[PDB]
Chain A
Amino acid sequence: ADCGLRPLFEKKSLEDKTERELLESYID
């Protein structure tokens, strides 16, 4: 119940260089 949660980003409350693009493909 901790998966998909990265220590260097999510847990650290940070995002990577391009996760934005992904999240933006949903919205359209």
Chain B
Amino acid sequence: IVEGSDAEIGMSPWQVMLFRKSPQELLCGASLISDRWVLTAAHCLLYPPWDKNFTENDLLVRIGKHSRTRYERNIEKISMLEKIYIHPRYNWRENLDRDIALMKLKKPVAFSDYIHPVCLPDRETAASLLQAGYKGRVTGWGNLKETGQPSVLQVVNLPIVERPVCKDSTRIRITDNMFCAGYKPDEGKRGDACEGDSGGPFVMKSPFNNRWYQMGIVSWGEGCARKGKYGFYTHVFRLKKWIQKVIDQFGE
């Protein structure tokens, strides 16, 4: 996270760190959506361009963490991957359209003050919360600037951007399955996701029921917090029909 602050304790009980077995390291970030499933971006698990095609027997998931590097005994929880599901129409060859994937945990994970599931929006909730101007939240142990690292989870609030504005900040092709956020060049403000925040959750709390909803997945960017450039996220709700498909079918 570029230009953030340290996550307050338990502030994001749904944040999940994607960990590599060997060599031990941080691959990406993700979110907890129930004791058995975790959500993340699809290029964190598969990306031919870099010869990436991880198998469940290659990585673990650390839930309820705060310290990036320390093993947080009696707080965080490490679970093993049962099975991995990547959206079938995930286009990595071009613009990472449908950058999303689901992780089925080997065994349920006990909730606590540091581990709790985030809500997924509904057509209605998405309808009234997903609007330019409104701010959302992004969390992770990703880089602080382009090119050190955070010692503790980082938090940042960002305002969503209008379709046109997002469209015109890049040469890359934007699809409806994605939206962008970030402060405008002249709003005179800085902040963004960065290396390692991938899969990260972009959330907002409905002022109606006071609950937090994950509206998007930290998907891709062109640098971190560059003027004129915006950060892109996987439009969660627009793909929830698929999520529900794999979940209710393959156990829940």
Q: Which of B121-142 contact A (CB under 8 A)?
A: 133-137
Q: Is the interface of B mostly helix, strand, loop or mixed?
A: loop
Check if B116 sits within 8 Å of A22, measured CB to CB.
Answer: no
Interface flags for B197-212 (1: CB within 8 Å of A; 0: not) read 0000000111101111
> What is the total number of residues of chain B having a CB less than 8 Å from a CB of chain A?
29
Q: What size tier do the contact residues of chain A reach? A: 20 to 34
A4-B211, A7-B113 known; A25+B134 contact, CB < 8 A:
yes
Q: Is the interface of A mostly helix, strand, loop or mixed?
A: loop
A25-B134, A28-B133 known; A8+B212 contact, CB < 8 A:
no
Check if B137 sits within 8 Å of A22, measured CB to CB.
Answer: yes
The answer to whether the Cβ of B26 comes within 8 Å of any Cβ in the partner chain is no
The answer to whether the Cβ of B213 comes within 8 Å of any Cβ in the partner chain is yes
What's the minimum C-beta distance from A8 to chain B, rounded to whole angstroms? Answer: 4
Binding site for B on A (CB under 8 A): 2-10, 16-19, 21-26, 28
